[PDB]
């Protein structure tokens, strides 16, 4: 099941969701509040580039999801695959595409912990030397 309404059954689930969202919303705001000008401009760069990728390849993104949705996979299955492909492939494209795809997986996943594990783990894999070179050069 991938729908949020399926998990919001009892009153308790609704209040837990509210509490969890509060904590996570508070933290993410406080985090952004403290981010230097440098980081903020890198966020704008990723906003623009990846949102354009989300649109320009919305079809392929849903294809890739249905591919992965075939069988169950762990956070390490996906991280390792990306790791393998980025080792041989050094273009900017595949990195932007991965950020978009992983971001989409995160939206479908209904487990907060496992989701953040993926984001944490994958963000390391993606942000290799050549990627940083691209982002710092387009400034």
């Amino acid at each position: 099941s991938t729908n949020i309404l399926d998990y919001l059954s009892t009153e308790r689930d609704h209040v837990m969701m509210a509490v969890q969202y509060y904590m996570s919303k508070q933290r993410l705001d406080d985090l952004y509040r403290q981010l230097p000008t440098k980081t903020r401009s890198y966020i704008d760069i990723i906003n623009m580039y990846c949102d354009k990728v989300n649109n320009d390849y919305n079809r392929d993104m849903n294809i890739m999801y249905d591919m992965a949705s075939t069988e169950s996979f762990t956070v390490y299955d996906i991280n390792n695959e990306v790791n393998t492909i980025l080792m041989d492939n050094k273009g900017l494209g595949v990195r932007l595409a991965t950020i978009s795809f992983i971001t989409e997986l995160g939206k479908r996943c209904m487990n907060p912990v496992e989701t953040i594990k993926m984001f944490t783990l994958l963000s390391h894999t993606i942000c290799d030397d050549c990627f940083i070179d691209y982002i710092t050069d387009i400034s």
Binding site: M64, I78, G93, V94
Partner: peptide, 23 residues
């Protein structure tokens, strides 16, 4: 893992297309 392999190739394919359209 076979499906994970397929997802991988797509990212590269999409990525190679992004590179081409840009630059």
């Amino acid at each position: 893992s076979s499906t994970m392999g397929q997802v991988g190739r797509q990212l590269a394919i999409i990525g190679d297309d992004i590179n081409r359209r840009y630059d």
